[PDB]
Write a structure and sequence with these properties.
Layout (H helix, E strand, L loop, with lengths): L16 E3 L1 E7 L31 E8 L5 E3 L10 E2 L11 E2 L3 E9 L5 E10 L1 E6 L10 H4 L8 E4 L5 E8 L5 E9 L4 E8 L14 E4 L9
Antiparallel strand pairs: 1-14, 2-3, 2-7, 4-13, 5-6, 7-12, 7-14, 8-11, 8-13, 9-10, 9-12
Bound molecules: a molecule of 2 linked components (BGC-GAL) and calcium ion.
A molecule of 2 linked components (BGC-GAL) binds next to loops.
Length: 225
């Protein structure tokens, strides 16, 4: 905390590497819906929700090779307490409309820095973003699918309205693929999933992950082979 974080990453040969992150989409129902108390579900506030509670309403979709402009800011919605259909950014490779007003998303895979140095990430959430990062915080090297819910204490915890903005700095090495797990929830209305970073020596933030997101084969033995 007085020094900067220096997380652990993974090694892999080039032949086991493909582009983009994996996405799972989960239902997050309203308590009740109006027209043709509070309406929204507080379950996302449960401490157990990020580790297993988030699957309890079932899934509805998934995609792979998620890459590029993965952030969004949907503040155009007009009606609350009501499902609103919209499409994810094309980065997600998911054509169907989702209940953008109310859904849960888990994004996982690997971050590779374009140069060795200190990276600062910034998240802005409506409603809820969790950020895990590193082979000892997000998931095990080459064992993502089996270990995806064994993440550690959060690297950033962003919740609307109060802690909605968070930041963190990690010194990362160019040659290494760092496990990354991004958890997102919208409970209702407006939806903001904004994840950006300032690369080393860079003043302007970027929200474009193109060339930074990769997937490794889940071949196990800490990627030996
Ligand atoms: O301001 C973002 C915040 O809005 C809440 O939704 C409100 C909505 O703004 C209001 O127009 C409607 O009448 O009631 C809603 C609350 O029941 C969201 O709940 C919150 O998640 C954010 O989206
Ligand atoms: Ca919301």
């Amino acid at each position: 905390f007085a020094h900067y974080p220096r997380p652990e990453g993974c090694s892999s040969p080039p032949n086991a590497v493909s582009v983009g992150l994996h996405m799972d989409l989960y239902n997050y129902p309203y308590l009740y819906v109006k027209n043709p108390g509070q309406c929204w579900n507080p379950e996302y506030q449960d401490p157990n929700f990020p580790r297993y509670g988030y699957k309890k309403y079932g899934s509805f979709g998934s995609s792979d090779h998620v890459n590029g402009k993965i952030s969004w800011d949907h503040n155009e919605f007009k009606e609350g307490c009501k499902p609103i259909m919209a499409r994810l950014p094309t980065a997600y490779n998911y054509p169907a409309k989702i209940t953008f007003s109310n859904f849960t998303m888990v994004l996982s895979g690997y971050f590779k820095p374009k140069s060795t140095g200190l990276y600062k990430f910034e998240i802005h959430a409506d409603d809820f973003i969790l950020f895990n990062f590193g082979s000892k915080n997000a998931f095990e090297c080459c064992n993502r699918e089996e270990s995806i819910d064994n993440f550690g204490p959060y690297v950033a915890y962003a919740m609307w309205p109060n802690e909605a903005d968070q930041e963190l700095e990690v010194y990362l090495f160019e040659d290494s693929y760092y496990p990354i797990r991004l958890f997102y929830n919208n409970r209702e209305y407006d939806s903001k999933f904004m994840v950006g970073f300032y690369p080393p020596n860079t003043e302007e933030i970027t929200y474009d992950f193109d060339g930074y997101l990769y997937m490794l084969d889940d071949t196990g033995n800490e990627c030996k082979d």
